[PDB]
Design an enzyme around this catalytic site. Structure first.
Site, PDB file in Angstrom:
ATOM      1  N   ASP A  88       0.780  -1.240   0.000  1.00 51.10           N
ATOM      2  CA  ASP A  88       0.000   0.000   0.000  1.00 51.10           C
ATOM      3  C   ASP A  88       0.801   1.274   0.000  1.00 51.10           C
ATOM      4  OD1 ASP A  88      -1.734  -2.024   0.157  1.00 51.10           O
ATOM      5  OD2 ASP A  88      -2.585  -1.504   2.077  1.00 51.10           O
ATOM      6  N   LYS A 118       2.280   1.467  -5.228  1.00 52.46           N
ATOM      7  CA  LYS A 118       2.896   0.800  -6.381  1.00 52.46           C
ATOM      8  C   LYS A 118       2.093   1.077  -7.662  1.00 52.46           C
ATOM      9  CE  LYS A 118       2.418  -3.169  -4.179  1.00 52.46           C
ATOM     10  NZ  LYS A 118       1.926  -2.670  -2.851  1.00 52.46           N
ATOM     11  N   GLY A 178      -4.461  -4.324  -4.369  1.00 52.06           N
ATOM     12  CA  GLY A 178      -5.482  -3.324  -4.636  1.00 52.06           C
ATOM     13  C   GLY A 178      -4.676  -2.083  -4.991  1.00 52.06           C
ATOM     14  N   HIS A 179      -4.292  -1.962  -6.261  1.00 46.91           N
ATOM     15  CA  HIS A 179      -3.487  -0.821  -6.653  1.00 46.91           C
ATOM     16  C   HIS A 179      -4.409   0.242  -7.232  1.00 46.91           C
ATOM     17  CE1 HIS A 179       0.078  -3.905  -7.128  1.00 46.91           C
ATOM     18  NE2 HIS A 179      -0.560  -4.010  -5.976  1.00 46.91           N
ATOM     19  N   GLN A 217       1.808  -6.502  -2.702  1.00 50.99           N
ATOM     20  CA  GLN A 217       2.121  -6.525  -1.279  1.00 50.99           C
ATOM     21  C   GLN A 217       3.436  -5.779  -1.026  1.00 50.99           C
ATOM     22  OE1 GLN A 217       0.827 -10.039  -2.660  1.00 50.99           O
ATOM     23  NE2 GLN A 217      -0.753  -8.447  -2.492  1.00 50.99           N
TER      24      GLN A 217
HETATM   25  N1  LIG Z   1      -2.262  11.660  -0.662  1.00 49.86           N
HETATM   26  C1  LIG Z   1      -1.608  10.842  -1.477  1.00 49.86           C
HETATM   27  N2  LIG Z   1      -2.230   9.728  -1.778  1.00 49.86           N
HETATM   28  C2  LIG Z   1      -1.513   8.967  -2.570  1.00 49.86           C
HETATM   29  C3  LIG Z   1      -0.276   9.212  -3.061  1.00 49.86           C
HETATM   30  N3  LIG Z   1       0.143   8.172  -3.860  1.00 49.86           N
HETATM   31  C4  LIG Z   1      -0.886   7.345  -3.789  1.00 49.86           C
HETATM   32  N4  LIG Z   1      -1.929   7.763  -3.024  1.00 49.86           N
HETATM   33  C5  LIG Z   1      -3.056   7.083  -2.571  1.00 49.86           C
HETATM   34  O1  LIG Z   1      -2.442   6.168  -1.665  1.00 49.86           O
HETATM   35  C6  LIG Z   1      -3.095   4.915  -1.657  1.00 49.86           C
HETATM   36  C7  LIG Z   1      -2.082   3.834  -2.005  1.00 49.86           C
HETATM   37  O2  LIG Z   1      -2.875   2.743  -1.582  1.00 49.86           O
HETATM   38  P1  LIG Z   1      -2.802   1.393  -2.426  1.00 49.86           P
HETATM   39  O3  LIG Z   1      -3.436   1.853  -3.689  1.00 49.86           O
HETATM   40  O4  LIG Z   1      -3.387   0.294  -1.564  1.00 49.86           O
HETATM   41  O5  LIG Z   1      -1.254   1.338  -2.768  1.00 49.86           O
HETATM   42  P2  LIG Z   1      -0.671   0.155  -3.662  1.00 49.86           P
HETATM   43  O6  LIG Z   1      -1.376  -1.033  -3.078  1.00 49.86           O
HETATM   44  O7  LIG Z   1       0.831   0.243  -3.479  1.00 49.86           O
HETATM   45  O8  LIG Z   1      -0.889   0.446  -5.124  1.00 49.86           O
HETATM   46  C8  LIG Z   1      -4.295   4.978  -2.679  1.00 49.86           C
HETATM   47  O9  LIG Z   1      -5.525   5.140  -2.006  1.00 49.86           O
HETATM   48  C9  LIG Z   1      -3.802   6.159  -3.584  1.00 49.86           C
HETATM   49  O10 LIG Z   1      -4.823   6.857  -4.369  1.00 49.86           O
HETATM   50  C10 LIG Z   1       0.392  10.392  -2.734  1.00 49.86           C
HETATM   51  O11 LIG Z   1       1.538  10.710  -3.088  1.00 49.86           O
HETATM   52  N5  LIG Z   1      -0.367  11.211  -1.909  1.00 49.86           N
HETATM   53  O1  LIG Z   2      -2.675  -7.796   0.105  1.00 46.66           O
HETATM   54  C1  LIG Z   2      -2.367  -8.023   1.270  1.00 46.66           C
HETATM   55  N1  LIG Z   2      -1.850  -7.102   2.163  1.00 46.66           N
HETATM   56  C2  LIG Z   2      -1.560  -7.689   3.386  1.00 46.66           C
HETATM   57  O2  LIG Z   2      -0.939  -7.230   4.348  1.00 46.66           O
HETATM   58  C3  LIG Z   2      -1.973  -9.168   3.282  1.00 46.66           C
HETATM   59  N2  LIG Z   2      -2.434  -9.245   1.963  1.00 46.66           N
HETATM   60  O3  LIG Z   2      -0.854 -10.037   3.531  1.00 46.66           O
HETATM   61  C4  LIG Z   2      -1.182 -10.963   4.537  1.00 46.66           C
HETATM   62  C5  LIG Z   2      -1.626 -12.319   3.998  1.00 46.66           C
HETATM   63  O4  LIG Z   2      -2.995 -12.340   3.404  1.00 46.66           O
HETATM   64  P1  LIG Z   2      -3.283 -12.822   1.882  1.00 46.66           P
HETATM   65  O5  LIG Z   2      -3.248 -14.305   1.940  1.00 46.66           O
HETATM   66  O6  LIG Z   2      -4.651 -12.323   1.727  1.00 46.66           O
HETATM   67  O7  LIG Z   2      -2.347 -12.003   1.061  1.00 46.66           O
HETATM   68  C6  LIG Z   2      -2.274 -10.289   5.396  1.00 46.66           C
HETATM   69  O8  LIG Z   2      -1.759  -9.459   6.467  1.00 46.66           O
HETATM   70  C7  LIG Z   2      -3.001  -9.500   4.313  1.00 46.66           C
HETATM   71  O9  LIG Z   2      -3.625  -8.316   4.757  1.00 46.66           O
HETATM   72  O1  LIG Z   3      -4.420  -2.573  -1.197  1.00 45.53           O
HETATM   73  C1  LIG Z   3      -4.388  -3.653  -0.672  1.00 45.53           C
HETATM   74  N1  LIG Z   3      -4.985  -3.850   0.611  1.00 45.53           N
HETATM   75  O2  LIG Z   3      -4.204  -3.470   1.721  1.00 45.53           O
HETATM   76  C2  LIG Z   3      -5.675  -5.149   0.823  1.00 45.53           C
HETATM   77  C3  LIG Z   3      -6.814  -5.044   1.800  1.00 45.53           C
HETATM   78  O3  LIG Z   3      -7.654  -4.135   1.658  1.00 45.53           O
HETATM   79  O4  LIG Z   3      -6.880  -5.885   2.716  1.00 45.53           O
HETATM   80  O1  LIG Z   4      -0.061  -3.678  -1.222  1.00 41.21           O
HETATM   81  P1  LIG Z   4      -0.928  -4.426  -2.174  1.00 41.21           P
HETATM   82  O2  LIG Z   4      -2.177  -3.643  -2.416  1.00 41.21           O
HETATM   83  O3  LIG Z   4      -1.519  -5.858  -1.736  1.00 41.21           O
HETATM   84  O4  LIG Z   4      -0.154  -4.935  -3.345  1.00 41.21           O
HETATM   85 MG   LIG Z   5      -2.911  -1.609  -2.057  1.00 39.40          MG
END
Ligand SMILES: Nc1nc2c(ncn2[C@@H]2O[C@H](COP(=O)(O)OP(=O)(O)O)[C@@H](O)[C@H]2O)c(=O)[nH]1
Ligand SMILES: O=C1NC(=O)[C@@]2(N1)O[C@H](COP(=O)(O)O)[C@@H](O)[C@H]2O
Ligand SMILES: O=CN(O)CC(=O)O
Ligand SMILES: O=P([O-])([O-])O
Ligand SMILES: [Mg+2]
Ligand SMILES: Nc1nc2c(ncn2[C@@H]2O[C@H](COP(=O)(O)OP(=O)(O)O)[C@@H](O)[C@H]2O)c(=O)[nH]1
Ligand SMILES: O=C1NC(=O)[C@@]2(N1)O[C@H](COP(=O)(O)O)[C@@H](O)[C@H]2O
Ligand SMILES: O=CN(O)CC(=O)O
Ligand SMILES: O=P([O-])([O-])O
Ligand SMILES: [Mg+2]
Lengths: 431, 431
Positions: A13, A16, A40-41, A224
């Site tokens: 998170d 990426k 969940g990117h 992850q």
């Molecule tokens: N405020 C802010 N939000 C960001 C930035 N880069 C990404 N985001 C938000 O940060 C979160 C990254 O969460 P996630 O998407 O789970 O990251 P990923 O799993 O690495 O792709 C998302 O809700 C994005 O829209 C940033 O530089 N500033």
């Molecule tokens: O996408 C993920 N982010 C996580 O930290 C996670 N999966 O990695 C670990 C293993 O779950 P999963 O089998 O769903 O990836 C959990 O902590 C789960 O939240």
């Molecule tokens: O963006 C990925 N998440 O952290 C997975 C979740 O919602 O559990």
């Molecule tokens: O951190 P992620 O959303 O699972 O790749």
């Molecule tokens: Mg994510």
């Protein structure tokens, strides 16, 4: 360098997706090499949001071929599910996405098991996303799992699946006393999408070999984060795949020597979603602030993410494990307003020692304590800035410090979810 | 280059052990990054033979530190077993061997399961070595397995183990109707060696990071072979680990970018031990000859190895998957006396197409047929030769041809099991 890797340094998170989508402008290919739909990117172009799970973050670009590499566990249901949604929004997924016949298939029963196994852990549940990633990985390594290729022959597939499900159901029924998954229902749901599935198959390794020799720009997109690595993470509170750079080669078929640049995605603070060690975890106003300000909720399960200060001790584990060439510092903006910002520079072991290295298995992290370096915060707005000049000296200092503490340059800085609220200082495709 | 990788290109038994032992002369460290005790690497110094399984092939050298990396599945029983034998022969194993706390532990029940699962396959049994590699890998990925580190706390270990064994026994007893493994017996046998075990623990990643920055010569020693790769091999007739170069990084903790040289060990002909596709398999006098002349029996199970001609089509899959920098051509001598020697240059698909690429999953290899290039044999003796000049032109030609057909130089040529019956043409530590 032609082959650029973008992975999560911390616990996922980090952002990426956003960085993949922004750097793919020059890419011919984007490849997801591990994970499944636990990822969940979130992409954001001119405010339009898209959270991808299984499908690579290059999809929004027509010039890019999106690849689902062998190392990924594929849920046919999740794919059709994401595919259609993208399609209705004008994304011809099918015209831009390729798959590996080696990809193991995640099927309904895998979720039954993942569910069963988690409850059985009770208070000690990992905090899995519930998608069945683990069971799929299990069956894989076990050599009883089904892969995309098994679909080439529907008759033998049905046979294979039958045995599999029988075995799996025995345990769900008897040992867990759980509801059994219906063979016929799985067979039907699957065969309904096999052709679509098999239509996107390509020999991913050979592709990458030729794309490589051609000098094409490939981008590998991680899922992850580093401390979630099945081997190097806080086992057993980890994900069942190798989220470390070594995964790129194993999950795609591209020889390890062909990696040119490993960009470590690093968030301005830290988060964890799921159970597991978190030295710098914050349960105070700052904790809630970090959460609130950074909309820290799971892009897949919607769970509240745990927040903490940036941990330099653990980030340096990421540095060496991954062969980082650079860091992309994300979400600086979320820090705006804070009077002081802290960064953990060392760990105080429960026996008294000051260490600057990290424990491995989760148990070994128990009483570990964080030692901070406290730096001045900043009042100015950082959000949307795309020029260091717009960054206040405190922030610049905080950036220099992270660099000092790591020995790796922060090549990119992100100031918002939007693809454009970013400043690229050194573009990995040039190095 | 400092970091040299030595792995099996074909289906294992190419002669990895011998080449590790010969090249480690300059090495400070040797690291096994995957497999377990299914490996059987045979060393031979002035005729004294040593077949290593779990312990790295650097052990016979005092100047070398032998490492068992996180990616390896560790059988405490197998270790003590090999350790003592080596000790009685004057090898102070304990004084030269290090381990990873991340290493998953293989325990008796893992063999019960591996046994159960194989019989259950009946005619379709993989042909596993029986050591329990798979179940160990399963539990690993599952996140219920025990690793070396769990031994740091014997009380919680016993608890952990109890649950584990309970779960495992339910299935062995009920589903398989197999003999149950006794918890108390496993607990005791294990705890009897825990201290010895834990005494060799080291933080392998950080070690390699510092050894790396120091410029030390590291040698990573592979187990099994490329086509046995859990992902890229003839699934499901594969081994449960990533025998491909990507494994080096995942199974040790050394960043992927730090690999400098990947030496592909290539036998003069081909062998397979276990079930699975083998296009160039020979069931004729030549087949038996190859077997007989090359003492082709499992260095671990003693099973007769299947023999066949060298397959260039499949070897090139090895080339790209592994980032080969070079090949070490082994067992040329075994070819002496043959009137003609054949090398498969292409595959005739069951639909009629001539292809020069390989299928993935085993099923997809079914009716595939080999297309050969037939070259002149040689009467001269090759055994023990350590100078190309001593090699007859036919052999030299055969070497050039393999090189032509692959685009990778044969840097080393081996003419006998003895460390000295070899000619190094280009030493990977210099490149
Ligand atoms: N405020 C802010 N939000 C960001 C930035 N880069 C990404 N985001 C938000 O940060 C979160 C990254 O969460 P996630 O998407 O789970 O990251 P990923 O799993 O690495 O792709 C998302 O809700 C994005 O829209 C940033 O530089 N500033
Ligand atoms: O996408 C993920 N982010 C996580 O930290 C996670 N999966 O990695 C670990 C293993 O779950 P999963 O089998 O769903 O990836 C959990 O902590 C789960 O939240
Ligand atoms: O963006 C990925 N998440 O952290 C997975 C979740 O919602 O559990
Ligand atoms: O951190 P992620 O959303 O699972 O790749
Ligand atoms: Mg994510
Ligand atoms: N004749 C001959 N035997 C060799 C040569 N190199 C190795 N050997 C023998 O070949 C076999 C290799 O088998 P194995 O040890 O299972 O190979 P490994 O598993 O790759 O280490 C052993 O029995 C060796 O002693 C060689 O160049 N010539
Ligand atoms: O060391 C090994 N060489 C093999 O080919 C083998 N193992 O790889 C496959 C998987 O067995 P295991 O689980 O014992 O490695 C089998 O064909 C087995 O013979
Ligand atoms: O050297 C390894 N062997 O091929 C294993 C066995 O004997 O089965
Ligand atoms: O002996 P190997 O081939 O490694 O198993
Ligand atoms: Mg062997």
């Amino acid at each position: 360098g032609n082959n650029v890797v973008v992975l999560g340094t911390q616990w996922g998170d980090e952002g990426k997706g956003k960085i993949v989508d922004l750097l793919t402008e020059r890419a011919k290919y984007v490849v997801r090499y591990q994970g499944g739909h636990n990822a969940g990117h979130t992409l954001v172009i001119n405010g339009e949001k898209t959270v991808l799970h299984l499908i690579p973050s290059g999809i929004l670009r027509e010039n890019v071929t999106s690849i689902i590499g062998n190392g990924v566990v594929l849920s046919p249901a999740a794919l059709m599910k994401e595919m259609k949604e993208l399609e209705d929004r004008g994304i011809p997924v099918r015209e831009r996405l390729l798959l590996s016949e080696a990809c193991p298939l995640i099927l309904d029963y895998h979720v039954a098991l993942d569910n069963a196994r988690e409850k059985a852990r009770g208070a000690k549940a990992i905090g899995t996303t519930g998608r069945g990633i683990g069971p799929a990985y299990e069956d894989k390594v076990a050599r009883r799992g089904l892969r995309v290729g098994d679909l080439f022959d529907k008759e033998t597939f049905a046979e294979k699946l039958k045995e599999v499900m029988e075995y799996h159901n025995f345990q769900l029924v008897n040992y867990y006393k759980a509801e059994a998954v219906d063979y016929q229902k799985v067979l039907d749901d699957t065969m309904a999408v096999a052709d679509i599935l098999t239509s996107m198959v390509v020999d991913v390794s050979d592709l990458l070999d030729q794309a490589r020799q051609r000098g094409d720009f490939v981008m590998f997109e991680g899922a992850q984060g580093t401390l979630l690595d099945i081997d190097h993470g806080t086992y057993p509170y980890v994900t069942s795949s190798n989220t470390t750079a070594g995964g790129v080669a194993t999950g795609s078929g591209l020889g390890p020597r062909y990696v040119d640049y490993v960009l470590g995605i690093l968030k301005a603070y830290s988060t964890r979603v799921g159970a597991g060690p978190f030295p710098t975890e914050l349960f105070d106003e700052t904790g809630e602030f970090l959460c609130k300000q950074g909309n820290e909720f799971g892009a897949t399960t919607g769970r509240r993410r745990r927040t903490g200060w940036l941990d330099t001790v653990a980030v340096r584990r990421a540095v060496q494990l991954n062969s980082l060439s650079g860091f992309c510092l994300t979400k600086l903006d979320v820090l705006d307003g804070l009077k002081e910002v802290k960064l953990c520079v060392a760990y105080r072991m429960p026996d008294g020692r000051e260490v600057t290295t990290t424990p491995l298995a989760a148990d070994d992290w128990k009483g570990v304590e964080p030692i901070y370096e406290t730096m001045p915060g900043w009042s100015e707005s950082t959000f949307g800035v795309k020029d260091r000049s717009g960054l206040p000296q405190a922030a610049l200092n905080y950036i220099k410090r992270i660099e000092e503490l790591t020995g790796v340059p922060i090549d990119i800085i992100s100031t918002g979810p939007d693809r454009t609220e970013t400043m690229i200082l050194r573009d990995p495709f040039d190095a």
